[PDB]
Amino acid sequence: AQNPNCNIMIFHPTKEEFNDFDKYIAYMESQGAHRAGLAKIIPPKEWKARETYDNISEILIATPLQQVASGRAGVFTQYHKKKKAMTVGEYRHLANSKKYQTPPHQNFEDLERKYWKNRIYNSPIYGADISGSLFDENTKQWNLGHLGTIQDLLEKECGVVIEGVNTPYLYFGMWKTTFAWHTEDMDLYSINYLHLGEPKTWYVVPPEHGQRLERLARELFPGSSRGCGAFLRHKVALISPTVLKENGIPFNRITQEAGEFMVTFPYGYHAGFNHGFNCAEAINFATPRWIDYGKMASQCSCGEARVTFSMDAFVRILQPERYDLWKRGQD
Ligand X SMILES: O=C(O)CNC(=O)C(=O)O
Binding-site sequence positions for Fe cation: 182, 184, 270
CA angle 265, 72, 78 (to 5 degrees): 55
Query: What x-and-dash track marks residues 191-230 binding Ni ion by CB under 5 A?
Result: ----------------------------------------
Kindly state the number of chain residues that form the binding site for Ni ion, as judged by CB under 5 A. 1
Asked if residue 304 binds Zn ion (CB under 5 A), the reply is yes
Question: From the CB of 173, what's the least distance to Mg ion, in Å?
Answer: 17
- Closest distance between Zn ion and the C-beta of residue 81, in Å? 20
Residues annotated within a binding site for Zn(2+): 228, 234, 300, 302
Q: What stretches of 4-132 show up as alpha helix (H) in DSSP?
A: 21-30, 88-95, 108-118
Of 120, 91, 116, 133, the residue nearest 276 (C-alpha): 91
Identify which of residues 171 and 277 has a Cβ nearer to ligand X in the complex. 171
Rounded (5°) CA angle 262-266-267: 110
Residue 249 interacts with ligand X (CB under 6 A)? no
Q: Is 58 in the site for Mg ion (CB under 5 A)?
A: yes
If binding is defined by CB under 5 A, does position 321 make contact with Mg ion? no
Looking at the chain, how many residues does it have? 331
Q: Which is nearer to Ni ion, 128 or 220 (CB)?
A: 128
Report the alpha-carbon angle 211-2-29, nearest 5: 75
Backbone angles phi, psi at 105, to 5 degrees: -155, 160
At 217, which helix (H) or strand (E)? helix 210-220
Interface with Zn ion: number of residues (CB under 5 A): 4
- DSSP states along 241-306: HHHHHHTT---EEEEE-TT-EEEEPTT-EEEEEE-SSEEEEEEEE--TTHHHHHHH-----SSSS-
Instruction: Write each residue from 213 to 252 as x if it is in contact with Zn ion (CB under 5 A), else as -, in one continuous string.
Output: ---------------x------------------------
To Mg ion, the closest distance from the beta carbon of 224 in angstroms equals: 39
Q: Of the candidates 192, 201, 301, 310, which one interacts with ligand X according to CB under 6 A?
A: 192
Q: Which of 179, 181, 221, 267 binds ligand X (CB under 6 A)?
A: 179
Name the residue whose CB lies closest to Ni ion: 190
Number of residues engaging ligand X in binding (CB under 6 A):
9
> Does 277 contact ligand X by CB under 6 A?
no
Residue closer to ligand X by CB (options 195, 200) is 200
Amino acid letter for position 23: K
* 58 interacts with, out of Zn ion, Mg ion, ligand X, none, CB within 5 to 8 A per kind: Mg ion
Which residues have a Cβ under 8 Å from the Cβ of 14 and sit 6 or more positions away? 44
Sign of CA dihedral 294, 296, 297, 299: positive
Question: Across the beta sheet with 237-239, what order do the strands follow?
Answer: 9-11, 38-41, 261-264, 189-197, 278-285, 169-173, 125-131, 65-72, 75-82, 237-239
If one asks whether residue 283 binds Zn ion (CB under 5 A), the answer comes out as: no
Q: Which stretch binds Zn ion (CB under 5 A): 53-61, 115-123, 216-224, 296-304?
A: 296-304
Detail the residues annotated as belonging to a binding site for 2-oxoglutarate. 126, 192, 200, 235
The correct pick among 91, 142, 171, 326 for binding ligand X (CB under 6 A) is 171
Q: Round to whole Å and give the CA distance between 78 and 83.
A: 15
Reduced to 3 states (helix: H, G, I; strand: E, B; else coil), residue 138 is coil
